[PDB]
Each structure stands twice: as C-alpha cells, then as structure tokens.
Amino acid sequence: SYNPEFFLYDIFLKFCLKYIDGEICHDLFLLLGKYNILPYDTSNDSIYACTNIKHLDFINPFGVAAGFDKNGVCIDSILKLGFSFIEIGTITPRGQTGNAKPRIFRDVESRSIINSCGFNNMGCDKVTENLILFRKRQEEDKLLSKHIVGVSIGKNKDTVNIVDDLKYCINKIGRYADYIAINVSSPNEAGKLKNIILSVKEEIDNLEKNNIMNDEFLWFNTTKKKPLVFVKLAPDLNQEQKKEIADVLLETNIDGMIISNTTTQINDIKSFENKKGGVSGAKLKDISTKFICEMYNYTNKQIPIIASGGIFSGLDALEKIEAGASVCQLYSCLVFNGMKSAVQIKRELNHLLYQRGYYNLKEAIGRKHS
C-alpha cells in the first residue's frame, strides 16, 4: 500500500496473473530476483515470534516451501522479501526436464494451484554450485546473516536405488545445507522409509566422521552444524499408514516433519477438472491442518512440525501453530499475494498473537490439543 516498491510490484503481479502463463510468471519473477530488483523487507522481526526446531533457530516463523526455487537461482532475493528460510529443490542427482508444459495452472477464485512439474531440476552438481555461490554472497550480505537454507532431495525417476540417490545428494550439497528434507512424497513399505531415513542420517554423520576440518570449515552453512534431517509427507494417506509412519519417525529419531505436500483428493475445482497433478493453496488448508493434528498426536508431541500449506494470513498461520506446527512455509501465497506476502503475514500473526493473549509464538504451539 504505502510502500511504493511493493505496491508497484503487486500491480505488476496482478497483470501477470491475469494475462501470463504461471510457470512463465514464476520464471520472470525468479529472473527479477536474480538481478536484484525485487523489494527488501529491512524491518526487525518481533522477538516474540522467533521459533526453533531443535538447535535450528528461525528469526521469524515464515519460510518458502520446496519447488519454488528448485535450482537455487534466486535464494538471496526471495529470503530478503522477509522470510527466515527457504527450502530449495526438490533436487535429484542428475538433472530432469520434468513433464510436458504447461504443467502449472492457477484457480484465482479458490486461490489454488495444480501442478505436474515432475521434478524438473538442473541436477545436484549444478544446484550445489548455485548454493555454494549463495553461501559466499551470504558472507558479504548483511540482510542474509542468520537466514536458513534447507535442501529438498529426491530420487531420479528411474533410479536403481532410492538410498544411493539420496547419498549422492548429501555427499555433494550436505556441507552447504542447514537441513535436508527427504521428499519421497510427491505426485508426478514403512521399513523402506526407516532405511531411507537411517541411510540419510548416516551419510551426514559420515561427512562429519571423515572430513579432517573443524566444523567452522566443514559446514559452510548458517548453523555451522551438520544439517538436520526432515521428511516431507503427502496428505493422501489412510489412518493406518499415518500411524505406521509415526512409528518410523519416532524410531529413527527424525529431526522434524514437513506436513504436507500437495493433494490429489480435491475434486471440486471447476477449472481443474481436465487437469492432473497435486493441488496447493486454500483448498489444501483444512486437509493439511487436520494432518498436522493427527501426526502431532501419533508422534506423542515428540517430533517438530513444519507446516505447509494453504497458508495466506496471520490467522491461517496461527491455526497451523495451534495444531502443532513450530514454523510455516508459504508457496501459493506468493503466487496470489505477491512480494508483500511475508511482511503482511508476519504483521498479521504478531497482532493476532497479542489479541489472543499469547506472550510469544512458542506458547501457541500445539495449544489446540486441550
């Protein structure tokens, strides 16, 4: 509104939404970020809305979800919109072109998206080089100081074993990540998951084990510690599957769970009737929130939750927090609300936390459970 850089951008984004293909719009804004002409949020975040996952400390509770910057080409400018963190990827060991275009469609009226990108990415080696270059800029760029970068990692479509795909990614990019997100949930048994999770924690342990450098020099990342390990879960699961996965997460000592990925359970979006892929945005909100409550329960409140999505407003964020989330990720909100998304949502959450009588954010976590 009053700030002109954000105002001009959000008129422009309105135009793009109306006229221009979604993926094209995405790439255009990625390109504007790469050349550093997006607005900055240079305001101090409220100390009462800080949050953490184990010893990973978030300056504010809002990050950007995976799939947004698949190749880490725009990390600086996206963070500087006011986010405390970003999950780049999903990356795979070798590059993949993804499914035929067009493959991202928006329904403005329901503020929802469907996609069948199919894990398009430049591959691990190139993204690692992109993240390295980010880490070097981060040493020089004051507004990036304590900002977190996680890396989502996945299997190549046709792989000979999932485990070794993940190990290759870890070995390449692990030193530059603050956390690693295991994405084995995506459109486009549980003993298999246990072995995946254990193989990942082991490869990270092995980076530590057999590098001769002190941690200051091995971990070229924000925390200067080894990356935490999270898993991202798809919401299209039966109650038994959820219970089983909960057990695996408890047993492997996973650092956190990202709940949730996109859903294929949505049938009532008119403009999407011909379309396949997973649905994001407002129509996912209730499903994701229900799923957070369930996994919070099934894991005995022992596993920190990263919420995603249908998160647009301060209210949406608080719902996720009170359902059990420690931190929130946005994707669709950036598509529909533009450059101002983080500024506006942080303010709305702050005002809401106060109205509800909460001293801080951490106080609200899980509060809907009695």
Ligand X SMILES: Cc1cc2nc3c(=O)[nH]c(=O)nc-3n(C[C@H](O)[C@H](O)[C@H](O)COP(=O)(O)O)c2cc1C
Ligand Y SMILES: O=C(O)c1cc(=O)[nH]c(=O)[nH]1
Ligand Z SMILES: Cc1cc(Nc2ccc3ccccc3c2)[n+]2[nH]c[nH+]c2n1
The catalytic site residues sit at: 186
Chain residues 85-104 in contact with ligand Z, contact rule CB under 6 A: 104
> Is 332 annotated as ligand-binding?
yes
Tokens 């920190």 locate to 304
Which segment (72-80, 164-172, 212-220, 331-339) binds ligand X by CB under 6 A?
A: 331-339
d(CA 330, CA 2): 23
Least Å distance between CB 34 and ligand Z? 9
Other beta carbons within 10 Å of 162: 18
Chain residues 185-244 in contact with ligand Y, contact rule CB under 6 A: 186-188
Nearer to ligand Z, 219 or 336 (CB): 336
Q: Is 255 helix (H, G, I), strand (E, B) or coil?
A: coil
- Using rule CB under 6 A, residue 215 touches ligand LDA: yes
Other beta carbons within 10 Å of 37: 11
Residues preceding gaps in the chain (C to N > 2.5 Å): 188
Question: Looking at residue 272, what DSSP letter applies?
Answer: G
Of 345, 335, 341, nearest in space to 27 by CA: 335
Least Å distance between CB 304 and ligand Y? 20
Nearer to ligand X, 148 or 333 (CB): 333
Least Å distance between CB 140 and ligand X? 28
Find the length of the chain. 370
Nearer to ligand Y, 104 or 328 (CB): 104
Chain residues 166-195 in contact with ligand Y, contact rule CB under 6 A: 183, 186-188
Nearer to ligand X, 59 or 65 (CB): 65
Of 366, 325, 78, 306, nearest in space to 180 by CA: 306
How many binding residues for ligand Z (CB under 6 A)?
Answer: 16
Name the binder of 188 from ligand X, ligand Y, ligand Z, none, CB < 5-8 A by kind.
ligand Y
Chain residues 251-280 in contact with ligand X, contact rule CB under 6 A: 261-262, 280
- Using rule CB under 6 A, residue 214 touches ligand LDA: yes
- Using rule CB under 6 A, residue 278 touches ligand Z: no
Of 82, 86, 63, 65, nearest in space to 74 by CA: 86
d(CA 180, CA 207): 14
Whether the Cβ atoms of residue 363 and residue 29 lie closer than 8 Å to each other: no
* Binding mask of the shown chain, residues 291 to 330, with x at each position contacting ligand Z by CB under 6 A: ----------------------------------------
d(CA 97, CA 351): 43
> Is 145 annotated as ligand-binding?
no
> Is 310 annotated as ligand-binding?
yes
Whether the Cβ atoms of residue 144 and residue 137 lie closer than 8 Å to each other: yes
- Using rule CB under 6 A, residue 152 touches ligand X: yes
Q: What is the CA radius of gyration of the chain?
A: 19
Name the binder of 78 from ligand LDA, ligand Z, ligand Y, none, CB < 5-8 A by kind.
ligand Z
d(CA 52, CA 83): 14
Q: What is the sign of the dihedral through the CA atoms of 304, 329, 199 and 236?
A: positive
* DSSP secondary structure letters along 298-330: HTTT-S-EEE-SS--SHHHHHHHHHHTEEEEEE
Q: Is 34 helix (H, G, I), strand (E, B) or coil?
A: helix
Name the binder of 214 from ligand LDA, ligand Z, ligand Y, none, CB < 5-8 A by kind.
ligand LDA
Whether the Cβ atoms of residue 165 and residue 200 lie closer than 8 Å to each other: no
Q: How far is C-alpha 66 from the geometric centre of its chain's CA atoms?
A: 4
Which residue ranges make up the site for ligand LDA (CB under 6 A)?
A: 214-215
Binding residues for FMN: 66-70, 90, 183, 232, 280-281, 308-310, 331-332
Which residue ranges make up the site for ligand Z (CB under 6 A)?
A: 13, 16-17, 22, 25-26, 29-30, 33, 38, 74, 78, 104, 106, 334-335
Which residue ranges make up the site for ligand Y (CB under 6 A)?
A: 67, 90, 115-119, 183, 186-188, 261-262, 278
Which residue ranges make up the site for ligand X (CB under 6 A)?
A: 65-67, 70, 89-90, 104, 113, 115, 117, 152, 183, 232, 261-262, 280-281, 284, 308-311, 330-333
Binding residues for substrate: 70, 115-119, 183, 188, 261-262
